[PDB]
RNA sequence: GCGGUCCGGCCGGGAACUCAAAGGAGACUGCCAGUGAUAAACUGGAGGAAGGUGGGGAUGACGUCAAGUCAUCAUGGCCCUUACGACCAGGGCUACACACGUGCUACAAUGGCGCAUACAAAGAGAAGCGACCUCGCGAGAGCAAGCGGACCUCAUAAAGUGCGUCGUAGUCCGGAUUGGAGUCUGCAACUCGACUCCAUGAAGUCGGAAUCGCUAGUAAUCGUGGAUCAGAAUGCCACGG
């Protein structure tokens, strides 16, 4: 029915956050699809670190954006009333599908 | 029935099967003249169970992803290892003294900024 | 190399030269539009074109209808 | 080199025929990474071979290795300032390492044909004491009577 | 063997290559609009398929034609005043690549 | 860096938002294999007539921070030092020193 | 020049970010610029507060600064009112709803920052640079602290020629990447230019 | 002239003179830059070589062959 | 695995498998023998996926070169302040007797060129990536779905293999340099863009003294991607065969 995406730069926050989420959906008691973990990304940036010509002297970062998959699919008015305007996450992007 | 292993080599994966009928193989739907007779990387594949007289007891269903030709070989010539793991492991010394146990653990280095691949350094020069 | 459709010209250096022949062979016109490329009712004038520092005069001729005014005003001076 | 002492790779043996020793071979003419036309050319020169000479596939390999391995070799080895090269025994091991490489080399040269050819020709004059490889041989052995003296 | 200077020994795609003007794919275009095969050689073509031939080549301008054409064009450009002329005259590059370093073809062999 | 060029900077986007945002129709609309009865010429000469601030190639996309043209960055707006100064305080949510 | 920076390297490991949302590159740049331009704003203006740690999360379309600091009274100024006339400026330079929350330290002399800042105004009141940072050395260890190092460099005391002075008491492991190190740098802008302040405080191992 | 890689090859050379051969199936290839020294018992076939390679002689097992660069000059054993 | 067929995970279906996640176990000379000063340790061995810091990356001590950057910034002094500040168009940074550094493509048959076909990994995308289809010999142009993405697109990987030919020639090697015809982006390709087609076919037949890199998935070779970027990599940064 209706499937939530979370995506985050920090995996020890987001799982908090996606077991929130399906916690509060099994406040109703049973039936719900469980935590996926859709395939991370790795965006690496290379950056000079001298302010002039030393170009082999450089650093590199990456911000890894940990995603997860809930896909609740009980039709349940609790489940959505319950839902939206309740999770209170906050540093966690929400998508959820309808 | 059937007895399974994964096998992997140098960024590819496997998936065989060791049901014991007559002897014969199949690799992604086709045999190995077919898919992997090409540059005659079939010795590897059949190594392990050729040490272990495949004769007629063995056909074999094998999936393989990712890696090149000789890349995928050495996975599933690992993973027959781990699959003939059903005729019980008092084979295990016989065949591990060949090798075919160890998974190869190498594999291509990082490009190394500043150099060109991984070791190769730009020429140099003192003026 | 241009486009497929619609040659250049810049708008003032296209009026210049409508006034020219509206007006017949005249003074040298002094512009800088070393892009804008040459119409066949431009060739009889003695239009001046810049090469950075100074309008070198060229007089259009028939064959230069496909170029544009700067490929025949030199930049750089050599030797 | 300095401090240890290194491993070895163990190789793998040669598809066609279970011998490692020609795997070896295959290996020096390999260029550029392509193994299969390493391969592709050592096979179908070495059958080439066996129409020439009568044995099978390996013995008329190995006989003219035999031929062009050397025993003894000069090495630099300088002690007061010196710039004499002091003949020394090459280690059995090294010694089918140095006839594999001049066979490959002098096989690079004599251009006659495609290298299928090239290398059949080698191994045959080597068969009979003949080609550039066994030349070689004779040279460095030459080299190191010349320098017997100084052992 | 015609086709103003001789063509020799050469399969017929790759022998007629050697008119100035005609390359790769025009010598392909030839053959294959006089039906000719093209594996074989100049030696093995009839006599009533060389006028053939000639009547293909006849289809596009050619060494005297050609040779005069492009000597028009770039003694037109000489003439010219234009960029691309002066470039002619001097022996420097046309296309606008380096003259810093590179440019040994159209400056010569090296001389100090 | 030459505040001057910072102002230039400003005004061109100014601009490049002010026509090209909206007005899009010469540059996408006339171009197409549309009649060309002096209409298509007309709407080339109107680019002409145009500021010269064309929307997108005018710009420059510098440093925010210090208006540095040269080491910008997309993703972080900066450029290669000032992306590297606020990393290493922790500014930049996630960016972590990253190594493999 | 050849240190890594202490907080950096350790930023996934020990010590936490400054800001703390998720924005796709649509965003990314322009909340980055909107979080400087209020840390500017901030700094700038609670200058005589003594601020240590500004870190901003944005929640629910909404930007919320947390503002670390050593004199919690002074930034609220009055009951509350420097709170208020600070969050409109905030939002109003934001464009965004801003929530503002403060935390006291009650350890400012084993703060880095707050410890850099102080060194550094000294040297601007024209203390002697020796006394300003061995006192800074003995205020962290006597407080509780496993270590501290205070580096100063730039032209001391008005030398013509500068040269780089530091002190350190106590343990510092800059290379172990489980110690809770705490790092930050000031300047100071005397009548003979920029003088430079580092700061590492070490605290515990893990 | 500068000369190519293949200089001279001879396949399955053969001649004979009524009863008597004096070239049976022999076969061999130049490379560039060598000197080859032709030695041999008197009338073995060694001028007769030099016929068949200046092009003088017809061999009965033909197979004589010079590269395209390949410039002959023949110096006779008779002044 | 189970019978299902528009034979394609398409299909209900199943968590067995690869995976992609988090959390866990694992490798510490742990065990054995020998050497060793009843040591530190070393040399072998069993077990194991991995064995003696398993592979490699981040990590760069005090200091040196008053080394590099007042042109990323900040900043003490000086200076200009109806100009050393500001705006605009054109030009230049792309010049060219020469010299050097770093590279790419070659001087071929372990190859070139045609036809057929196999096996990757990583990554990027919303004024963006742009299916399919139609028209172009092509660069592509029109129409136009889908995708903020393990879903869609970029995206058929190439070396490989199979067949055929070319038979050692400055050639069916080399692909420069010039002449036409054009496509794109861009307000605009003359100075001074990239790319495609037709034509041309230059040096070059392996390099003097000298000199550089590399110890294993390394060198060598083959392709792919990304940042910057309207357009513009033989550079850089990454990935795999
Ligand atoms: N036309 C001929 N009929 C019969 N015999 C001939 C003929 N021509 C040559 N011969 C013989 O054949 C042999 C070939 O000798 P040729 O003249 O080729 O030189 P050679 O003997 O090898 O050398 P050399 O000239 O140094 O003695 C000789 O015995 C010669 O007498
Ligand atoms: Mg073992
Ligand atoms: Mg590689
Ligand atoms: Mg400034
Ligand atoms: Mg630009
Ligand atoms: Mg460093
Ligand atoms: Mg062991
Ligand atoms: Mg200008
Ligand atoms: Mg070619
Ligand atoms: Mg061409
Ligand atoms: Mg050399």
């Given amino acids: ?98 | ?127 | ?79 | 080199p300095r401090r240890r002492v290194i491993g070895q790779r163990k190789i793998l043996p040669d598809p066609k025929f279970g011998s490692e020793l020609l795997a070896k071979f295959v290996n020096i003419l390999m260029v550029d990474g392509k193994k299969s036309t390493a391969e592709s050319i050592v096979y179908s020169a070495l059958e080439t071979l066996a129409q020439r000479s009568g044995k099978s596939e390996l013995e008329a390999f190995e006989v003219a290795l035999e031929n062009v391995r050397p025993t003894v070799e000069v090495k630099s080895r300088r002690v007061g300032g010196s710039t004499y090269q002091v003949p020394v025994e090459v280690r059995p091991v090294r010694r089918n390492a140095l006839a594999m490489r001049w066979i490959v080399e002098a096989a690079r040269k004599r251009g006659d044909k495609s290298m299928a050819l090239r290398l059949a020709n080698e191994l045959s004059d080597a068969a009979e004491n003949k080609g550039t490889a066994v030349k070689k041989r004779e040279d460095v052995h030459r080299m190191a009577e010349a320098n017997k003296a100084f052992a | 063997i015609a086709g103003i200077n001789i063509p020799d020994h050469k399969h017929a795609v790759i022998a007629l290559t050697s008119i100035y003007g005609v390359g790769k794919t025009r010598s392909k275009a030839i053959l294959a609009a006089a039906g000719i095969a093209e594996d074989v050689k100049i030696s093995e073509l009839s006599e009533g398929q060389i006028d053939t031939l000639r009547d293909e080549v006849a289809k596009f301008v050619v060494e005297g034609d050609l040779r005069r054409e492009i000597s028009m064009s770039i003694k037109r450009l000489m003439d010219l005043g234009c960029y691309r002329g002066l470039r002619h005259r001097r022996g420097l590059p046309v296309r606008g690549q380096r003259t810093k370093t590179n440019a040994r073809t159209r400056k010569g062999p090296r001389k100090p | ?100 | 020049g050849q240190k890594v920076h202490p907080n950096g390297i350790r930023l996934g490991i020990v010590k936490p970010w400054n800001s703390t949302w998720f924005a796709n590159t649509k965003e990314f740049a322009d909340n980055l610029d909107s979080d400087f331009k209020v840390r500017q704003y901030l700094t700038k203006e609670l200058a005589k507060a003594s601020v240590s740690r500004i870190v901003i999360e944005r929640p629910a379309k909404s930007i919320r600064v947390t503002i670390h600091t050593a004199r919690p009274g002074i930034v609220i100024g009055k009951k509350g009112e420097d709170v208020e006339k600070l969050r409109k400026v905030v939002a109003d330079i934001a464009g965004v709803p801003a929530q503002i929350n403060i935390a006291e330290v009650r350890k400012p002399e084993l703060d880095a920052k707050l410890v850099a800042d102080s060194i550094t105004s000294q040297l601007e009141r024209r203390v002697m640079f020796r006394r300003a940072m061995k006192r800074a050395v003995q205020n962290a260890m006597r407080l509780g602290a496993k270590g501290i190092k205070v580096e100063v460099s730039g032209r001391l005391g008005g030398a013509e020629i500068a040269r780089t002075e530091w002190y350190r008491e106590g343990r510092v492991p800059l290379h172990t990447l489980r110690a809770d190190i705490d790092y930050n740098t000031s300047e100071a802008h005397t009548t003979y230019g920029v003088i430079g302040v580092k700061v590492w405080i070490f605290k515990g191992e893990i | 002239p500068r000369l190519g890689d293949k200089v001279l090859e001879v396949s399955n050379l053969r001649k004979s003179y009524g009863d008597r051969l004096l070239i049976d199936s022999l076969s061999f290839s130049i490379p560039k830059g060598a000197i080859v020294g032709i030695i041999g018992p008197n009338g073995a076939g060694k001028s007769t070589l030099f016929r068949m390679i200046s092009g003088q002689e017809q061999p009965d097992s033909g197979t004589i062959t010079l590269g395209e660069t390949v410039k002959l000059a023949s110096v006779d054993q008779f002044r």
């Fill in chain 1, 1 to 98: 029915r209706i499937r939530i995406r979370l995506k985050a730069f920090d995996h020890r926050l987001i799982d908090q956050a996606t077991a929130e989420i399906v916690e509060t959906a099994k406040r109703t008691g049973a039936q719900v699809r469980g935590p996926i973990p859709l395939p991370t990304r790795k965006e690496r940036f290379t950056v000079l670190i001298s302010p002039h010509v030393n170009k082999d002297a450089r650093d590199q970062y990456e911000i890894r954006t940990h995603l997860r998959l809930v896909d609740i699919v009980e039709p349940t008015e609790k489940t959505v009333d319950a839902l939206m305007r309740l999770d209170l996450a906050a540093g966690v992007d929400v998508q959820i599908s309808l």
């Fill in chain 2, 1 to 127: 029935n059937q007895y399974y292993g994964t096998g992997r080599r140098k960024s590819s994966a496997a998936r065989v099967f060791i049901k014991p009928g007559n002897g014969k193989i199949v690799i992604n739907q086709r045999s190995l003249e077919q898919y992997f007779g090409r540059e005659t990387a079939r010795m590897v594949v059949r190594q392990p169970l050729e040490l272990v007289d495949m004769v007629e007891k063995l056909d074999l269903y094998i999936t393989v992803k990712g890696g090149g030709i000789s890349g995928q070989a050495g996975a599933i010539r690992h993973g027959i290892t781990r699959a003939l793991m059903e005729y019980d492991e008092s084979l295990r010394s016989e065949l591990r003294k060949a090798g075919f146990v160890t998974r190869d653990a190498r594999q291509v280095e990082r490009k190394k900024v500043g150099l060109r691949k991984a070791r190769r350094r730009p020429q140099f020069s003192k003026r």
């Fill in chain 3, 1 to 79: 190399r241009s486009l497929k459709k619609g040659p250049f010209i810049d708008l003032h250096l296209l009026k210049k030269v409508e006034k020219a022949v509206e007006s017949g062979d005249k003074k040298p016109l002094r512009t800088w539009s070393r892009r804008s490329t040459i119409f066949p009712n431009m060739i009889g004038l003695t239009i001046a074109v810049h090469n950075g520092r100074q309008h070198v005069p060229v007089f259009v001729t028939d064959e230069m209808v496909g170029h544009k005014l700067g490929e025949f005003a030199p930049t750089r001076t050599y030797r």
């Fill in chain 6, 1 to 100: 860096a030459k505040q001057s060029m910072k102002a230039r900077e400003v005004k061109r986007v100014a601009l490049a938002d002010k026509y090209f945002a909206k007005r899009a129709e010469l540059k996408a609309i006339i171009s197409d294999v549309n009649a060309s009865d002096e209409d298509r010429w007309n709407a080339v000469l109107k680019l002409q007539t145009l500021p010269r601030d064309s929307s997108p190639s005018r710009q420059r996309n510098r440093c925010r921070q210090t208006g540095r043209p040269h080491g910008f960055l997309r993703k972080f707006g900066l450029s290669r030092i000032k992306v590297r100064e606020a990393a290493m305080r922790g500014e930049i949510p996630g960016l972590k020193k990253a190594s493999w």
